Amino acid sequence: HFYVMLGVIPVTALVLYANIFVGPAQLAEIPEGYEPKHWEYEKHPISRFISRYILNSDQQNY
């Protein structure tokens, strides 16, 4: 219980910090000539941060 609470408390702090103080992106049409990046293709800020800073893009592996 101690070591699941010591995990949950920074995790729940990061989840409310991501949803409340940053918030998810809004879906919109692609503007002409933008050529968007890979981390633009996801909605949640944690998913965007993971796809930008940690995980490799699909284009690179492809």
Ligand X SMILES: CCCCCCCCCCCCCCCCCC(=O)OC[C@H](COP(=O)([O-])OCC(O)COP(=O)([O-])OC[C@@H](COC(=O)CCCCCCCCCCCCCCCCC)OC(=O)CCCCCCCCCCCCCCCCC)OC(=O)CCCCCCCCCCCCCCCCC
Catalog residues that contact ligand X under the rule CB under 6 A: 8, 11-12, 15-16, 19-20, 23-24, 44
Q: Are 42 and 48 in contact (CB under 8 A)?
A: yes
Q: Which of 11, 30, 32, 53 binds other proteins (CB under 8 A)?
A: 30
Name the nearest CA neighbour of 48 among 37, 60, 32.
37
Report if residue 23 touches other proteins, rule: CB under 8 A.
Answer: yes
Cα→Cα distances 53→31, 33, 34, 57, Å:
24, 24, 21, 10
**Least distance CB 3 / other proteins (angstroms):** 9
Q: How far is the CB of 54 from ligand X (least distance, A)?
A: 16
Closest distance of CB 12 from ligand X, Å = 4
